[PDB]
Amino acid sequence: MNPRPIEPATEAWLWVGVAGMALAAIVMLAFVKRARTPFEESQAVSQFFVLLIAFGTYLAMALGQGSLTADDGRQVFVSRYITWTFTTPLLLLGLATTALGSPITRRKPVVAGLIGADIIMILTGLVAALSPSGSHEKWIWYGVSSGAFLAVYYLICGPLLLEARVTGADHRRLYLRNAVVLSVIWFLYPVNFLLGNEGLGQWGGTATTAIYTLLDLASKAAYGFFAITGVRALTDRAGAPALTLDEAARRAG
Amino acid sequence: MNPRPIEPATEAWLWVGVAGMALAAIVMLAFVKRARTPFEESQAVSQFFVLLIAFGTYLAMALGQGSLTADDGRQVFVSRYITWTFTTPLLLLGLATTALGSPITRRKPVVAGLIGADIIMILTGLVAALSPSGSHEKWIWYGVSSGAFLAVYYLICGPLLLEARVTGADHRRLYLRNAVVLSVIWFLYPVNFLLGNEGLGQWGGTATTAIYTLLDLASKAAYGFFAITGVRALTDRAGAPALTLDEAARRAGGT
Amino acid sequence: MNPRPIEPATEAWLWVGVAGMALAAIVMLAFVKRARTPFEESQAVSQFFVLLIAFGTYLAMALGQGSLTADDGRQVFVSRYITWTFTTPLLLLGLATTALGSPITRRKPVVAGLIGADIIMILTGLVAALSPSGSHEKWIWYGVSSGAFLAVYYLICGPLLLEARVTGADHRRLYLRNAVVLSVIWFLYPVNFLLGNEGLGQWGGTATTAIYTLLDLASKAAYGFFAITGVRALTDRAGAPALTLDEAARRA
Ligand SMILES: *C/C=C(C)/C=C/C=C(C)/C=C/C1=C(C)CCCC1(C)C
Ligand SMILES: *C/C=C(C)/C=C/C=C(C)/C=C/C1=C(C)CCCC1(C)C
Ligand SMILES: *C/C=C(C)/C=C/C=C(C)/C=C/C1=C(C)CCCC1(C)C
Ligand SMILES: CCCCCCCC/C=C/CCCCCCCC(=O)O
Ligand SMILES: CCCCCCCC/C=C\CCCCCCCC(=O)O
Ligand SMILES: CCCCCCCC/C=C\CCCCCCCC(=O)O
Ligand SMILES: CCCCCCCC/C=C\CCCCCCCC(=O)O
Ligand SMILES: CCCCCCCC/C=C\CCCCCCCC(=O)O
Ligand SMILES: CCCCCCCC/C=C\CCCCCCCC(=O)O
Ligand SMILES: CCCCCCCC/C=C\CCCCCCCC(=O)O
Ligand SMILES: CCCCCCCC/C=C\CCCCCCCC(=O)O
Ligand SMILES: CCCCCCCC/C=C\CCCCCCCC(=O)O
Ligand SMILES: CCCCCCCC/C=C\CCCCCCCC(=O)O
Ligand SMILES: CCCCCCCC/C=C\CCCCCCCC(=O)O
Ligand SMILES: CCCCCCCC/C=C\CCCCCCCC(=O)O
Ligand SMILES: CCCCCCCC/C=C\CCCCCCCC(=O)O
Numbered sequence: 001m002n003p004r005p006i007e008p009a010t011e012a013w014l015w016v017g018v019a020g021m022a023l024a025a026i027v028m029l030a031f032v033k034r035a036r037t038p039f040e041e042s043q044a045v046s047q048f049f050v051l052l053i054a055f056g057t058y059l060a061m062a063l064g065q066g067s068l069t070a071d072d073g074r075q076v077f078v079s080r081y082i083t084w085t086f087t088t089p090l091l092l093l094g095l096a097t098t099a100l101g102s103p104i105t106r107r108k109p110v111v112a113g114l115i116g117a118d119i120i121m122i123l124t125g126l127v128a129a130l131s132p133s134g135s136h137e138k139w140i141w142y143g144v145s146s147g148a149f150l151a152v153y154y155l156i157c158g159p160l161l162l163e164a165r166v167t168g169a170d171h172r173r174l175y176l177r178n179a180v181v182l183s184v185i186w187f188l189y190p191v192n193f194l195l196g197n198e199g200l201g202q203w204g205g206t207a208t209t210a211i212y213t214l215l216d217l218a219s220k221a222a223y224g225f226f227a228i229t230g231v232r233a234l235t236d237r238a239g240a241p242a243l244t245l246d247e248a249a250r251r252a253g
Numbered sequence: 254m255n256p257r258p259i260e261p262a263t264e265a266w267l268w269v270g271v272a273g274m275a276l277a278a279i280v281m282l283a284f285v286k287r288a289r290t291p292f293e294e295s296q297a298v299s300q301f302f303v304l305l306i307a308f309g310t311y312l313a314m315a316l317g318q319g320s321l322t323a324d325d326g327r328q329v330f331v332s333r334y335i336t337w338t339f340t341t342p343l344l345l346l347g348l349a350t351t352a353l354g355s356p357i358t359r360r361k362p363v364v365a366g367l368i369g370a371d372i373i374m375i376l377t378g379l380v381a382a383l384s385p386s387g388s389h390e391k392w393i394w395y396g397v398s399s400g401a402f403l404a405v406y407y408l409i410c411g412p413l414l415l416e417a418r419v420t421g422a423d424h425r426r427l428y429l430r431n432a433v434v435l436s437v438i439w440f441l442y443p444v445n446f447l448l449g450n451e452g453l454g455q456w457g458g459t460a461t462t463a464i465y466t467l468l469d470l471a472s473k474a475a476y477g478f479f480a481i482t483g484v485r486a487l488t489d490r491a492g493a494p495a496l497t498l499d500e501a502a503r504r505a506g507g508t
Numbered sequence: 509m510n511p512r513p514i515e516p517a518t519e520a521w522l523w524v525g526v527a528g529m530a531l532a533a534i535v536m537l538a539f540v541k542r543a544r545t546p547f548e549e550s551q552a553v554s555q556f557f558v559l560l561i562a563f564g565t566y567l568a569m570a571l572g573q574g575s576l577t578a579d580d581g582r583q584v585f586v587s588r589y590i591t592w593t594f595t596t597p598l599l600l601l602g603l604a605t606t607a608l609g610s611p612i613t614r615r616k617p618v619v620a621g622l623i624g625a626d627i628i629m630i631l632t633g634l635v636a637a638l639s640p641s642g643s644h645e646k647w648i649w650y651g652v653s654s655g656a657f658l659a660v661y662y663l664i665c666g667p668l669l670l671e672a673r674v675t676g677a678d679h680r681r682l683y684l685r686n687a688v689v690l691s692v693i694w695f696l697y698p699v700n701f702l703l704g705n706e707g708l709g710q711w712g713g714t715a716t717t718a719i720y721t722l723l724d725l726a727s728k729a730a731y732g733f734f735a736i737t738g739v740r741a742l743t744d745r746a747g748a749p750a751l752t753l754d755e756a757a758r759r760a
């Protein structure tokens with residue numbers, strides 16, 4: 001995997017993604033080390049691996065090792081799609097865990113369907129990104145990926161929201177708070193695809209890479225601390241032990 | 254991923270897989286929304302993602318984006334094997350939860366071993382499909398894949414069947430009714446590989462693709478609706494609630 | 509996937525890995541059949557699939573169908589990295605199952621992070637192996653992979669060890685027993701990477717493939733029977749039933 005040449009402006013935006021995800025992961029690891037309940041531990045570990053994998057994929061892209069040449073000649077950062085397949089289910093799992101508790105006590109096949117529809121969304125998106133410009137198959141997969149996105153929206157706004165009301169009041173508030181912010185940020189992703197050089201090409205590759213970088217920092221770092229502070233607040237309102245799970249394990253032995 | 258040329262008769266068989274898997278997945282999604290028990294919901298979304306993933310892989314193949322050329326020169330539809338790795342464990346998951354209930358509360362290692370033996374089968378079958386024609390590497394991996402196939406057969410007819418009767422008489426009948434149909438349909442897959450153009454070459458790639466298409470429609474759409482109506486009759490027999498899972502969550506969430 | 513020829517001395521070491529992983533997997537399947545408790549059955553089939561997948565990857569490498577030509581010109585056995593991504597989490601699953609029991613009823617995200625950090629380690633190690641020799645990118649991913657290794661060592665020596673003490677004295681004794689032997693053997697893998705032909709190049713591709721074979725044989729076959737013997741001894745001290753789980757299912 002010899003490093004590939006990148007435009008200076010594009011590589012600069014990728015290094016902003018590296019430094020952003022690295023710092024956010026370090027702070028998010030603190031929420032892991034200080035988790036007090038299984039719900040707080042699951043949410044913390046999920047968010048941390050979102051940032052940690054995102055740091056790796058931006059390091060791969062910045063080092064010129066996360067892109068290849070499509071058949072039409074464009075440069076597609078496939079590493080971004082590869083890790084999106086793993087980070088975006090962890091984000092959605094956080095929503096489903098908020099709505100159904102940790103460990104998941106009910107409606108597990110709707111959680112698996114959430115992850116499944118999301119993984120399909122990314123994978124069919126990669127195919128649309130690798131399809132040649134101006135081709136019908138490029139937008140057939142775009143509409144296929146958008147249909148998976150619509151089903152993720154439906155599960156978040158329909159079944160999973162119905163179960164949030166069943167779980168509890170504070171779980172319903174946190175879920176609605178986190179599901180709304182996530183849904184607004186994620187909506188801009190197909191907009192960048194449609195207008196970036198992975199689609200209609202209204203703006204070039206550097207702008208496309210920059211917007212994806214800012215969206216990734218928003219959906220992972222900014223939203224992650226937005227969500228992990230709501231988890232911590234819910235765990236405070238729920239009256240959690242003033243003890244980490246590790247400290248509770250040390251005293252139980 | 255620019256579309257690669259495909260023989261017209263082969264492309265025609267791929268589209269009948271697209272139309273069949275697309276209509277089957279839409280109908281199966283109704284079984285998901287109508288689910289009333291955890292067992293009914295687990296079985297429903299499993300079959301739905303079986304049909305849904307099969308739709309996309311036949312779409313990819315029909316669009317000329319689901320195959321590559323092996324080093325020996327043949328055209329291999331690798332997309333089929335790629336999604337087979339995910340749709341065939343979901344089918345067997347349905348058998349596992351029919352024998353052990355949903356959620357699976359015991360014998361999880363035998364379910365993971367079932368899924369694992371199945372993934373090894375498809376993955377090693379891909380290597381045999383990409384190995385050269387008339388080589389020994391092809392039939393070693395064909396032999397390895399057949400070994401994992403026998404492991405699947407043993408787990409279905411052995412420990413899982415022994416566990417089905419422990420769950421109950423209704424779960425035993427459903428399991429034995431669906432496992433027999435599934436096992437008869439799945440046996441024809443290695444026969445097609447053996448005689449198709451990714452094996453000995455009794456028939457060409459068009460006939461091979463056609464047989465795989467029909468076998469996929471049978472094992473996924475035909476068997477899927479055969480199976481999922483069995484799990485609905487089981488819930489009806491056991492007195493299932495008059496409310497779906499969503500409607501039950503709406504009652505317990507409304508005020 | 510047409511086979512690419514290998515050095516006969518290298519292919520010889522690969523075929524001894526096929527023979528070793530096959531022989532261990534057949535015996536380990538006998539432990540699967542004899543499983544008496546859900547804990548004993550979880551460890552058995554986990555260790556079995558470790559040997560089985562290792563048999564297939566050495567078969568793929570021995571047949572000349574599991575290597576790659578990196579951009580810099582070297583030959584990398586990517587099949588080994590591909591299956592490492594699956595077998596190494598199963599090994600740590602055994603330790604995690606030893607510490608928390610089967611099924612895992614608590615601290616599930618610490619097992620997922622254990623698996624997650626181990627996967628990142630093998631994947632970033634593969635990227636390090638494919639990166640050109642004598643380049644900064646290779647050793648950037650080597651350090652990144654080494655950091656994921658230290659996370660694995662931290663979780664094993666940290667929260668999992670504390671949780672093994674909570675599960676019971678027999679599980680804590682078995683956990684420390686298998687965790688120390690696993691940790692010592694795994695430490696030798698980055699040593700072979702650093703000094704082998706996918707690193708500094710102290711020795712060529714033949715010695716690197718031979719050491720990985722010996723290391724895989726030791727960490728999977730030798731350790732696997734060392735671990736599964738402690739698993740059966742643990743359930744033996746627990747007075748485990750003389751019935752297998754399948755025999756219990758037939759009677760019930
Ligand atoms: C951290 C990464 C995140 C939150 C990624 C989000 C990606 C999406 C919501 C996907 C968007 C796409 C479509 C719905 C259509 C095709 C193009 C994609 C993949 C950008
Ligand atoms: C929907 C797809 C299904 C049910 C796939 C079934 C595939 C098999 C049962 C596998 C067959 C193979 C062998 C047992 C040996 C090697 C060739 C294969 C992969 C066709
Ligand atoms: C059966 C296979 C086993 C136990 C593999 C273990 C592999 C490791 C502990 C990984 C070692 C690596 C590093 C820590 C840094 C980069 C090079 C690696 C991948 C060999
Ligand atoms: C270049 C040297 C620095 C290394 C770069 C980053 C290395 C990646 C390290 C892995 C972090 C994994 C932490 C997982 C612990 C989870 C805690 C838990 O689950 O309770
Ligand atoms: C420290 C945590 C690291 C997390 C995992 C790292 C994620 C990136 C991993 C490697 C992605 C490589 C993608 C390259 C695909 C082929 C394109 C090419 O290089 O030619
Ligand atoms: C290449 C396409 C990849 C798609 C990945 C799909 C991920 C799995 C899809 C959904 C599985 C849903 C099955 C429900 C599991 C219920 C668990 C149970 O109770 O048994
Ligand atoms: C050219 C445009 C083609 C349009 C194709 C439409 C794509 C539909 C995508 C699949 C949605 C599947 C997800 C359904 C939710 C699962 C239900 C559940 O888990 O409970
Ligand atoms: C946007 C959500 C609905 C999904 C619809 C899928 C495709 C239509 C959306 C954008 C495509 C833009 C117009 C391009 C059509 C083909 C013209 C071309 O080949 O360049
Ligand atoms: C042109 C591409 C876009 C076309 C619109 C596609 C619409 C598909 C949207 C998803 C439907 C999801 C319904 C799933 C029902 C789940 C049942 C449940 O478990 O509650
Ligand atoms: C949410 C998006 C808001 C609007 C953002 C618009 C961005 C426009 C930026 C400049 C357009 C041209 C981009 C220059 C990149 C050239 C690189 C290339 O073409 O390969
Ligand atoms: C609430 C969600 C917020 C999402 C933030 C990301 C959306 C807006 C992103 C920035 C728009 C402008 C992009 C920068 C263009 C200049 C890049 C360049 O061409 O050099
Ligand atoms: C580091 C770059 C950040 C880019 C913008 C981040 C996008 C916004 C992310 C979420 C922050 C929350 C925004 C406002 C919360 C409103 C609360 C509510 O919805 O009730
Ligand atoms: C089971 C439902 C089946 C649905 C009907 C499927 C119809 C398939 C028909 C042929 C597909 C097109 C074949 C490609 C030929 C293109 C050559 C040309 O147009 O010149
Ligand atoms: C959203 C509804 C449809 C679901 C689609 C998701 C299922 C799988 C999608 C397509 C898989 C494509 C894999 C083919 C890549 C082969 C590589 C190649 O030929 O170059
Ligand atoms: C007909 C040729 C046979 C070749 C034999 C060699 C191939 C072996 C293939 C995989 C064996 C899979 C074993 C899986 C059973 C697991 C046991 C369990 O989970 O309880
Ligand atoms: C205990 C093992 C039971 C299984 C027995 C079947 C194993 C078959 C072994 C492989 C035969 C491969 C033949 C390759 C011939 C190579 C000769 C050459 O060209 O150099």
Ligand SMILES: CCCCCCCC/C=C\CCCCCCCC(=O)O
Nearest residue numbers: 273467468470471474475478479482
């Ligand atoms: C080669 C096989 C092609 C398969 C495609 C045709 C689809 C199969 C049609 C329906 C199968 C229904 C199976 C069980 C019927 C249940 C109806 C009922 O309960 O009354």
Ligand SMILES: CCCCCCCC/C=C\CCCCCCCC(=O)O
Nearest residue numbers: 273276277280474478482485486489
């Ligand atoms: C051509 C591929 C699509 C095939 C569609 C097959 C349609 C099968 C529809 C369901 C018929 C069964 C009615 C629902 C279950 C009733 C049986 C029962 O509850 O006991």
Ligand SMILES: CCCCCCCC/C=C\CCCCCCCC(=O)O
Nearest residue numbers: 527528531532534535536538539542
């Ligand atoms: C160096 C070439 C070796 C050739 C193969 C050697 C085979 C014998 C090796 C040891 C296997 C021991 C298996 C233990 C049998 C357990 C039987 C029991 O008590 O249930």
Ligand SMILES: CCCCCCCC/C=C\CCCCCCCC(=O)O
Nearest residue numbers: 373560561564565568573574575587
């Ligand atoms: C019983 C067997 C179980 C193990 C199955 C897995 C065996 C190994 C799987 C595939 C290894 C493929 C290695 C990559 C091939 C590179 C050749 C190339 O395409 O250039």
Ligand SMILES: CCCCCCCC/C=C\CCCCCCCC(=O)O
Nearest residue numbers: 362365366369550554557610611612
């Ligand atoms: C090349 C990939 C081959 C397939 C990889 C997947 C194989 C996994 C096999 C199953 C081992 C799992 C053992 C069951 C442990 C669960 C019970 C527990 O966690 O306590």
Ligand SMILES: CCCCCCCC/C=C\CCCCCCCC(=O)O
Nearest residue numbers: 042045046049102616617620624627
């Ligand atoms: C290509 C990058 C590969 C990344 C490896 C896989 C990453 C897995 C990371 C950890 C999984 C998230 C842990 C969350 C625990 C949830 C369990 C629960 O429901 O309580």
Ligand SMILES: CCCCCCCC/C=C\CCCCCCCC(=O)O
Nearest residue numbers: 029032033246655658659662666667
């Ligand atoms: C120069 C220093 C290099 C350091 C490399 C990276 C070190 C990583 C070490 C392990 C990090 C583990 C973090 C886990 C947090 C606590 C987990 C818990 O017990 O809940």
Ligand SMILES: [Cl-]
Nearest residue numbers: 054083084087
């Ligand atoms: Cl990512």
Ligand SMILES: [Cl-]
Nearest residue numbers: 307336337340
């Ligand atoms: Cl499929």
Ligand SMILES: [Cl-]
Nearest residue numbers: 562591592595
């Ligand atoms: Cl391995």
